[PDB]
Amino acid sequence: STPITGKVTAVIGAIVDVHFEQSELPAILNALEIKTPQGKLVLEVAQHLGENTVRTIAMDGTEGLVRGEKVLDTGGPISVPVGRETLGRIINVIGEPIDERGPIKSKLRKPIHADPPSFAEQSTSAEILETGIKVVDLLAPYARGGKIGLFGGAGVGKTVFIQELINNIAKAHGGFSVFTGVGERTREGNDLYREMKETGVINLEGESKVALVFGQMNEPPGARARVALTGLTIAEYFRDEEGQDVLLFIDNIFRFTQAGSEVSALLGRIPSAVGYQPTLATDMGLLQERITTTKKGSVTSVQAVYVPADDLTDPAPATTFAHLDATTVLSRGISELGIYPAVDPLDSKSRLLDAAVVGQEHYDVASKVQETLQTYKSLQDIIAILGMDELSEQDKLTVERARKIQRFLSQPFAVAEVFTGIPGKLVRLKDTVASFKAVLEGKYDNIPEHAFYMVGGIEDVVAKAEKLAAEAN
Amino acid sequence: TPITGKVTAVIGAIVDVHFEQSELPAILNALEIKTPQGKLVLEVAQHLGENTVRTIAMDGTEGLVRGEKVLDTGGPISVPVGRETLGRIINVIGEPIDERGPIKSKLRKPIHADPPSFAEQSTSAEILETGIKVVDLLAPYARGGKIGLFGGAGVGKTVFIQELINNIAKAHGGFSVFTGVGERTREGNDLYREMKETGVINLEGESKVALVFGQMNEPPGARARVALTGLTIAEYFRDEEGQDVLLFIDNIFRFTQAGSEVSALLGRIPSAVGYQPTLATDMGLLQERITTTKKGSVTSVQAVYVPADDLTDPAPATTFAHLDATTVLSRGISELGIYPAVDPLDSKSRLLDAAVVGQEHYDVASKVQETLQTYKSLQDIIAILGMDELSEQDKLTVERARKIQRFLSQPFAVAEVFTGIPGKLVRLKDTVASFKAVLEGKYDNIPEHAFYMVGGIEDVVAKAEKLAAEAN
Amino acid sequence: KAQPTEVSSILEERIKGVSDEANLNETGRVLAVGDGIARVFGLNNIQAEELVEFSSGVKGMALNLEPGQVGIVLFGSDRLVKEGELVKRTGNIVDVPVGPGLLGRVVDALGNPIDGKGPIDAAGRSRAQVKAPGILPRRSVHEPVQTGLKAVDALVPIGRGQRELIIGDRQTGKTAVALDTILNQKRWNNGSDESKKLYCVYVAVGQKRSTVAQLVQTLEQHDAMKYSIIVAATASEAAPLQYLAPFTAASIGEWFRDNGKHALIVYDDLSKQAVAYRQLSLLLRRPPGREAYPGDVFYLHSRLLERAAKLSEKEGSGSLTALPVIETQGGDVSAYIPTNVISITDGQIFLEAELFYKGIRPAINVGLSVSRVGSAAQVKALKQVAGSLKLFLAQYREVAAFAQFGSDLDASTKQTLVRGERLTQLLKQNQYSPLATEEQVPLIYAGVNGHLDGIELSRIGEFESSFLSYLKSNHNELLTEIREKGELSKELLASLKSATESFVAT
Amino acid sequence: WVRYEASLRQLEQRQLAKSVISRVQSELGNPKFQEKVLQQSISEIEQLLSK
Amino acid sequence: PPPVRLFGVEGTYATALYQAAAKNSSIDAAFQSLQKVESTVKKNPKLGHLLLNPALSLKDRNSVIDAIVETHKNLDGYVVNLLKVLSENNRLGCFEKIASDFGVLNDAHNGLLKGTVTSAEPLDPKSFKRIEKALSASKLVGQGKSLKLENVVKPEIKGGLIVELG
Numbered sequence A: 001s002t003p004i005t006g007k008v009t010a011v012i013g014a015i016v017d018v019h020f021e022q023s024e025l026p027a028i029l030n031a032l033e034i035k036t037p038q039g040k041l042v043l044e045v046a047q048h049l050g051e052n053t054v055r056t057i058a059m060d061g062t063e064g065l066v067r068g069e070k071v072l073d074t075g076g077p078i079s080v081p082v083g084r085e086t087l088g089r090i091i092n093v094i095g096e097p098i099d100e101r102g103p104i105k106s107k108l109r110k111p112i113h114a115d116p117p118s119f120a121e122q123s124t125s126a127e128i129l130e131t132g133i134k135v136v137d138l139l140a141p142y143a144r145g146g147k148i149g150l151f152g153g154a155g156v157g158k159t160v161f162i163q164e165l166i167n168n169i170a171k172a173h174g175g176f177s178v179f180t181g182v183g184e185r186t187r188e189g190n191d192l193y194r195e196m197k198e199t200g201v202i203n204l205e206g207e208s209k210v211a212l213v214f215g216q217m218n219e220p221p222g223a224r225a226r227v228a229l230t231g232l233t234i235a236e237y238f239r240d241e242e243g244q245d246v247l248l249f250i251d252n253i254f255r256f257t258q259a260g261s262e263v264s265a266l267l268g269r270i271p272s273a274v275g276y277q278p279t280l281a282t283d284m285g286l287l288q289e290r291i292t293t294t295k296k297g298s299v300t301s302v303q304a305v306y307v308p309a310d311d312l313t314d315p316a317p318a319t320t321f322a323h324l325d326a327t328t329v330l331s332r333g334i335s336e337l338g339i340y341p342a343v344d345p346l347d348s349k350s351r352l353l354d355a356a357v358v359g360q361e362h363y364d365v366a367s368k369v370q371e372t373l374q375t376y377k378s379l380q381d382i383i384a385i386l387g388m389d390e391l392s393e394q395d396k397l398t399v400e401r402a403r404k405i406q407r408f409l410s411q412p413f414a415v416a417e418v419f420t421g422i423p424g425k426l427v428r429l430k431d432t433v434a435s436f437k438a439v440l441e442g443k444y445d446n447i448p449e450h451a452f453y454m455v456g457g458i459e460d461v462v463a464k465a466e467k468l469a470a471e472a473n
Numbered sequence B: 001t002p003i004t005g006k007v008t009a010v011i012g013a014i015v016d017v018h019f020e021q022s023e024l025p026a027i028l029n030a031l032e033i034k035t036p037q038g039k040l041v042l043e044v045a046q047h048l049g050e051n052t053v054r055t056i057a058m059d060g061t062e063g064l065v066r067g068e069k070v071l072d073t074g075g076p077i078s079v080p081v082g083r084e085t086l087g088r089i090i091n092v093i094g095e096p097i098d099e100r101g102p103i104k105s106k107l108r109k110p111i112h113a114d115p116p117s118f119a120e121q122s123t124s125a126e127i128l129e130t131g132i133k134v135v136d137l138l139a140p141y142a143r144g145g146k147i148g149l150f151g152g153a154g155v156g157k158t159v160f161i162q163e164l165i166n167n168i169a170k171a172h173g174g175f176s177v178f179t180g181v182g183e184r185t186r187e188g189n190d191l192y193r194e195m196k197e198t199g200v201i202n203l204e205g206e207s208k209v210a211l212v213f214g215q216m217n218e219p220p221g222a223r224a225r226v227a228l229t230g231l232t233i234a235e236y237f238r239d240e241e242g243q244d245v246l247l248f249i250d251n252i253f254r255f256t257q258a259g260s261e262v263s264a265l266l267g268r269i270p271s272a273v274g275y276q277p278t279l280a281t282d283m284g285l286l287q288e289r290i291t292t293t294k295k296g297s298v299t300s301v302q303a304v305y306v307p308a309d310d311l312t313d314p315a316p317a318t319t320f321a322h323l324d325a326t327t328v329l330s331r332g333i334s335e336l337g338i339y340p341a342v343d344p345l346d347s348k349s350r351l352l353d354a355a356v357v358g359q360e361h362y363d364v365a366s367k368v369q370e371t372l373q374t375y376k377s378l379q380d381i382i383a384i385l386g387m388d389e390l391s392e393q394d395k396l397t398v399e400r401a402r403k404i405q406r407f408l409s410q411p412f413a414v415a416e417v418f419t420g421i422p423g424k425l426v427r428l429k430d431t432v433a434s435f436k437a438v439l440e441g442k443y444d445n446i447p448e449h450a451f452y453m454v455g456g457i458e459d460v461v462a463k464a465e466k467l468a469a470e471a472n
Numbered sequence C: 001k002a003q004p005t006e007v008s009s010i011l012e013e014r015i016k017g018v019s020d021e022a023n024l025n026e027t028g029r030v031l032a033v034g035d036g037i038a039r040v041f042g043l044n045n046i047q048a049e050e051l052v053e054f055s056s057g058v059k060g061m062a063l064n065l066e067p068g069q070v071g072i073v074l075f076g077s078d079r080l081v082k083e084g085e086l087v088k089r090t091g092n093i094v095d096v097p098v099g100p101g102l103l104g105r106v107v108d109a110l111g112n113p114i115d116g117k118g119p120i121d122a123a124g125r126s127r128a129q130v131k132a133p134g135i136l137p138r139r140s141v142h143e144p145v146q147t148g149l150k151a152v153d154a155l156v157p158i159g160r161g162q163r164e165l166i167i168g169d170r171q172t173g174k175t176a177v178a179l180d181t182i183l184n185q186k187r188w189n190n191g192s193d194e195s196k197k198l199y200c201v202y203v204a205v206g207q208k209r210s211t212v213a214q215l216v217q218t219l220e221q222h223d224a225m226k227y228s229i230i231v232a233a234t235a236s237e238a239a240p241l242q243y244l245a246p247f248t249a250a251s252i253g254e255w256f257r258d259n260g261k262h263a264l265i266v267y268d269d270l271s272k273q274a275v276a277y278r279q280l281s282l283l284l285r286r287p288p289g290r291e292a293y294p295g296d297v298f299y300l301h302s303r304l305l306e307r308a309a310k311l312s313e314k315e316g317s318g319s320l321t322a323l324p325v326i327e328t329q330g331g332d333v334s335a336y337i338p339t340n341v342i343s344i345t346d347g348q349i350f351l352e353a354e355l356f357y358k359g360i361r362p363a364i365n366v367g368l369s370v371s372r373v374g375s376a377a378q379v380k381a382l383k384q385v386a387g388s389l390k391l392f393l394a395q396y397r398e399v400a401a402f403a404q405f406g407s408d409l410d411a412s413t414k415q416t417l418v419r420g421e422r423l424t425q426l427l428k429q430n431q432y433s434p435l436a437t438e439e440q441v442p443l444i445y446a447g448v449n450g451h452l453d454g455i456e457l458s459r460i461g462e463f464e465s466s467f468l469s470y471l472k473s474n475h476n477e478l479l480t481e482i483r484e485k486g487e488l489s490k491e492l493l494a495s496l497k498s499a500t501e502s503f504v505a506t
Numbered sequence D: 001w002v003r004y005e006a007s008l009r010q011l012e013q014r015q016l017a018k019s020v021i022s023r024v025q026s027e028l029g030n031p032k033f034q035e036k037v038l039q040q041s042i043s044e045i046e047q048l049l050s051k
Numbered sequence E: 001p002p003p004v005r006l007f008g009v010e011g012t013y014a015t016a017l018y019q020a021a022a023k024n025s026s027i028d029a030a031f032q033s034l035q036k037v038e039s040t041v042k043k044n045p046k047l048g049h050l051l052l053n054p055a056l057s058l059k060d061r062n063s064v065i066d067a068i069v070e071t072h073k074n075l076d077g078y079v080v081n082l083l084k085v086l087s088e089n090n091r092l093g094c095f096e097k098i099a100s101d102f103g104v105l106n107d108a109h110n111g112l113l114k115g116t117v118t119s120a121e122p123l124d125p126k127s128f129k130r131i132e133k134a135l136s137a138s139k140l141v142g143q144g145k146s147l148k149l150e151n152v153v154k155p156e157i158k159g160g161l162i163v164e165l166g
């Protein structure tokens, strides 16, 4: 057919306005094309302005854009390669292989923008995924067909938690996995790429079990807002066409809403609360509803969210709370207390923590742990000013047990051993529940509280106490 | 043929009408348009230009098309006024709510009038005996004055209004009008059947209360004008009949809220924390239309809802300047169990002075107020540190003030559903003498629980003796 | 299946018949389409809030009727719409089908069967914006709604036509109380007395489709779907659909209310209703109000909630009980929408995470949780006949009022302390386990004559269960007598006291 | 054996969806597009003549 | 009472011109003169519409509008007043000309290019829009066939979609 051609009228930051000709108006969310000297600049259409003019979003920098330049319509939404060949190939927001390992030989190409899979939804909320981390297994078990929280501020260790999960889950699992990586440091992406190379998950001349998508903060807002959907498209192709259990990973979903707010101001909409886009909940729901268990197949998605200025009431984190079953807040106060992981046990929370699913004994153990830890927070104000000697004997017993517990929730990681000096360790669910119930019963109260720090099972606490009483004391 | 206009724009409650004829209806004129059910009425507020006026609708704008015929009534909203309006339920534009036929009357007054002049300003010093201990000891009410019930959501403003109705409105008062402004329709039905069963309104007989209702279900326009309709009927009773009426408004904050509700769509820059820029002037007009003149007296008791129990919100704060005897209700003492919930300190009245209530009453009120002041000043010491590290005088004051503050609680006749205890009405000198005796220390041996939920000090003695009885 | 083939054939023939009978000329032309918004030149005689069809097949509602071009929101995506598209007019205001065939089905905001169980048998078609009943055509609430939660029954009564708010924080148990009430209504929903039937209608605005799938699986497991209707507005749907869904469900319940029956509406997470309305108003260039919300959100909530009422005998003495849910950020009830909704409802049910982590599973803050109706809308057996069930509110206020600041002075203080803590441990209940009034009465009655002698705190739960067993066995006469007559007579009080003390000695 | 029948109902409609693809691909390769304009002409005559 | 609403937005100038003509006379002479003016301004586009730029001072605008009125003062009636008011107000003079043409044609022509399911171009020179559309459509289908290209007609595709949706 004839190539749909038009003229660029306005270039406003990352927003480009294109005037077209008689009945040549393209579609919303449809890729356009600008022949830039560097390469190809696509103009995803956002809104229609009338008079044969459309408002578009640029997926690359708009440097050197002269008004009246020739534009070309692709004819559809952004198309990306999909298939097993993508495994081991690092792609971008548009789909070009940025791993310089040759052209991608994909057999199918699918549109980026899809629709939620209606009511073809199963609900198998009974698969407790064994993570290995003591704190998460007890108070907020991760479902094999759910969406995982990972909240927290700057430098709280959310990426380290993601690396621990990719170390403990991806290796021992049958099913493809996808890492999208929205708006993180290229250094982190490079380390993650290398580590999967040495581990063997991706072999340059082998099988490879991960499809690597990457959009960092070097991309303009449009690419940072579209790369998540691009990775989600790969996940959807692997769940449907291949019928495998996919393991979608991102690095930060807050960057998507941040880029949406970036483009909203110049798009011409009235600002929402604290300067966010009006279409926050709608767009975020569109993004996070396509990711679902999907009767023909199943998905686990370990989400990751950045809280602005450590504000849990910020509109984007507050809205994304509702679309997650297993959550992890990673409070900073726990981080300056030195307990790593810095997850707050009083706000972790998950649906799977019910006696029918996890077991009556586990439910009671978790409940009693919650009580012991919450008494400490309740009495903090009295302890902080007056002191523990002004408390009752039962209050003293509860507060010291709470201190022992909250110190025992810490666990070394096999990824952050350089920051600890202790080799990483893994604890099974049956071991940690038994250890916590043993500590709750009072079997270990003569043990010094310091013996619970950077340990695994209760036997490790006993050994550490033995050493502490041996040479330290 | 009256002035005819065409509908040009319908944005929410804002309806824009263009009058092709050069003649234009002025602002505050009522408009008439043919709707399938009844007759939707409009209200000119701005003259936009090009023979176009901006109007607000008293009812919903559902089903309107651009081009509907608009009829100019030639005047403001006329509400029927007269003795025949007693015992009837009236909407914002005059028509009755109760299915009892048309309101046969011979006078139709506009709901937009001017406040009485300064030469017409009267004065009063009489004390309204209410039977409630707190508002008769700390904030006495003045006959022909303004009473303000400040409080949040769930504090007990409506219960207090109902109690004041039951006590004062019966017998004491030539007439009374109750205006429901943006309030629960269930409670409106509660008012209605209590009125019918008490006999203050008789359907086959003479009534004493006129009822006009604008509730939350109505759109903002009706909620911004029902109070003015109540003002119109009350002023008609006060002036022409020369009668002392009892204007009982509820949730007057809803009028300003409805004004801010359409302020944004009218094309006005919002004011601080999202209110209309003109709240002060319009609400001042409404309040100064409520005053005791030399032709008659009006006794106004209206409850003011404070948003998020904040007394610094612009609306309640600006209302404070319009109210003589402010009776603010506090949440804290409400969850402490004192359901009368009148704050002993913050609630202040102008009528409290030795020249009116008597020297002894003023002395008793001052002493009890300063004792509560001292008690609340020591709350930190008692709570976080401890009560055992106080001086003997500090302790004695603490127990005395606790006894007094739980002695301020009184049974309410309309609270049997909650309290389950029969209501008590304690007369003025009874309260003064009882609290003077408690102040002096004659009754220090009685435990604090005998002061809770009681009437006079004789009831306290009876309760103490009976507590000793089942305590054995 | 050839039958659907000829069904589709006759569908297509009436499709042609309907399509080629319009000859419209005012059919407008799309000027520009925004993020779910489309200004259109045309529709000179369009009514306000009126539904439209686009030539592509997407519906639209006429919000803004400014001169020249018209503001149309989109029930769905702006995916298929372009400029210069002919926009068909329905001729009627947005409507939702109503009827008794809705029971056991799941539909969307408009009312289309979305569960995939075939079409819907609708007895009528009512508006989404209908006027609330007037001051006279209604009656005060007297019949109590049995929640099955002891803390929600004996302490904060609810009845036919009231408006009780489940105010609270995230994942505190807000949906739990609603689903527990829905399950509890099964006791009388299986009978024949229609004056005691409570059909349940539930809204899901913003909740993900997985959550509603688990929920509907829940109601069908306990066999409650047969008398329940689920309307769903997931976050994936457009903002207009979410904003419209609660009104449609209100009309659905009003069908039963006006037909003399009794129904219960759960306005689950009405806050995302407000944020969808925010998106609507902002995308329409309507001047915003406080903190970017549209001004008329108070009117939005008032018009929606006040439609629930208890009708009087003249019209049929029907009822509709509103059960809205609002989530607050960090317990901030001073927030705008929380203040509006606390000022709009007929009481509230506060839930906070702190009591939830203290062990209290309902997490009912009895200090703030209050009902505007007390003795009214309460079973008499849980009332003056039990005596203290008139005044446990004061007792639980005082027990909290002397925890450490009101330190124990004498034996009376110690007795009240033990009584209060035993009771607070007694009020605990578990989800998915609704209870009945006839066994509420014995447990709390034991809370006045022998509760401090309970067999230590960690074992008062099986104490209450064994008390229930000792009253269902060998004592069924008491449970019956108190369950049909609904109150406790003098001899019945004597028998109940005798049984309580007999098991106390046990 | 019931939801298998129900799944039999759902799957049967699904191949009918791709059947329409076979149907619609048959729709685009005909001279009826020339003949179809006469269908509008006779139809639009019947439309306004009713008025 | 002008027949049509232009809803302002630079279009009120055309309505004002039409009302000024209708109050006394010359509905046609002013309009034909304005058509000639637009023909002249499009005759030399590089000097015609580039001169309607906003970077051009007020007395520059007076000079250009004085330059417009030549060739036997073709600007007749109140159109000179329109040029004057456009000198001290918004400059470019093309859109309101089209709006005025639209108004005068509604006054005299009443032609709309309908066809509903048919994408025809049947202009109708008659004020009575009752049955003349039949003759217009018959003439435009018997001959010409300008576009008449629905590509695909809506009813079958939308019906198939809704049927396969259930």
Ligand SMILES: Nc1ncnc2c1ncn2[C@@H]1O[C@H](COP(=O)(O)OP(=O)(O)OP(=O)(O)O)[C@@H](O)[C@H]1O
Binding pocket: A152, A153, A154, A155, A156, A157, A158, A159, A160, A161, A306, A340, A341, A412, A413, A416, A419, A420
């Ligand atoms: N398990 C752990 N053991 C030791 N140190 C840890 C652990 N987890 C995180 N840290 C430390 O936390 C700090 C931040 O780590 P990380 O890069 O994961 O932060 P982040 O929260 O993902 O950051 P950002 O907000 O920039 O994305 C580092 O100093 C790292 O050593």
Ligand SMILES: Nc1ncnc2c1ncn2[C@@H]1O[C@H](COP(=O)(O)OP(=O)(O)OP(=O)(O)O)[C@@H](O)[C@H]1O
Binding pocket: A322, A350, A351, A352, A353, A354, C169, C170, C171, C172, C173, C174, C175, C176, C177, C327, C361, C362, C429, C430, C431
């Ligand atoms: N009585 C109970 N016993 C045990 N667990 C309970 C009880 N009530 C609530 N929970 C648990 O508390 C959590 C939240 O409860 P629920 O499902 O009612 O959510 P919610 O408060 O409505 O929150 P959301 O707004 O996130 O949907 C769930 O994990 C649920 O299992």
Ligand SMILES: Nc1ncnc2c1ncn2[C@@H]1O[C@H](COP(=O)(O)OP(=O)(O)O)[C@@H](O)[C@H]1O
Binding pocket: B151, B152, B153, B154, B155, B156, B157, B158, B159, B160, B339, B340, B412, B415, B418, B419, C370, C371, C372, C373
């Ligand atoms: N004197 C009282 N006795 C008993 N209960 C009261 C009293 N005052 C207030 N309450 C309680 O406070 C609740 C709210 O009262 P209401 O006046 O409706 O609130 P608001 O003051 O916000 O209008 C009522 O349900 C009632 O139970």
Ligand SMILES: [Mg+2]
Binding pocket: A158, A159, A160
């Ligand atoms: Mg990081």
Ligand SMILES: [Mg+2]
Binding pocket: B157, B158
């Ligand atoms: Mg009230």
Ligand SMILES: [Mg+2]
Binding pocket: C173, C174, C175, C176
């Ligand atoms: Mg919930």
